[PDB]
Amino acid sequence: ASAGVAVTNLNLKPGHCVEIKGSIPPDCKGFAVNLGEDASNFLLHFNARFDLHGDVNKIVCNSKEADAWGSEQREGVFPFQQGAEVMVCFEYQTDKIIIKFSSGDQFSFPVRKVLPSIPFLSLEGLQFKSITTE
């Protein structure tokens, strides 16, 4: 809303990727990028937390099924700074989604539901600059 674009009919199929460019509000405790079927089912919820729910400078990744959050996965890397810009790429593969940052860092997250395509994308706490898929 404030910072929360939603893309529908994304049509992201295996072997393709979507890159997001945004800027992080100074008053932001964290931002999230969600990839899924709709607002209640996320294949991937990528949440960079600066100071949120007890996590300080930690990336929490999870899936959501029918509004019930899955098994969280946490990552050590955190190449973000408030007020700075952000460039993340998500590469969708049938067996995993690989997240890459402009910083050169990368990690993978398991695909818990093989979908023919990912129709929905939404951002939270991120001021949208550009979205592009290949």
Ligand X SMILES: CC(=O)N[C@@H]1[C@@H](O)[C@H](O[C@@H]2O[C@H](CO)[C@H](O)[C@H](O)[C@H]2O)[C@@H](CO)O[C@@H]1O
Q: Give the annotated binding-site residues.
A: 45-49, 53, 62, 69-72
**Across 24-105, where does the E strand assignment appear?**
30-38, 41-49, 58-65, 68-69, 73-75, 85-93, 96-101
Please give the Cα distance from 4 to 125 (Å, whole number). Answer: 6
Short-list 48, 53, 44, CA closest to 108: 44
Site string for its own copies, 105-134 (x = CB under 8 A): -----------------------xxxxxxx
Using CB under 6 A, which of 34, 44, 47, 80 touches ligand X? 47
Tell me which of 53, 112, 113, 129 binds ligand X, using CB under 6 A.
53
Question: Considering only 33-41, 45-53, 92-100, 108-116, which stretch makes contact with ligand X by CB under 6 A?
Answer: 45-53
Q: For 115, phi and psi rounded to 5 degrees? A: -115, 145
Q: Does 60 bind ligand X (CB under 6 A)?
A: yes
The single residue listed with the structure tokens 């992201």 is 12
x/- letters, 10..49, toward its own copies (CB under 8 A): xx---------x----------------------------
User: How many Å apart are CA 83 and CA 28, to the nearest integer?
Assistant: 9
Instruction: Mark 75-114 with x for binding to ligand X (rule: CB under 6 A) and - for no binding.
Output: ----------------------------------------
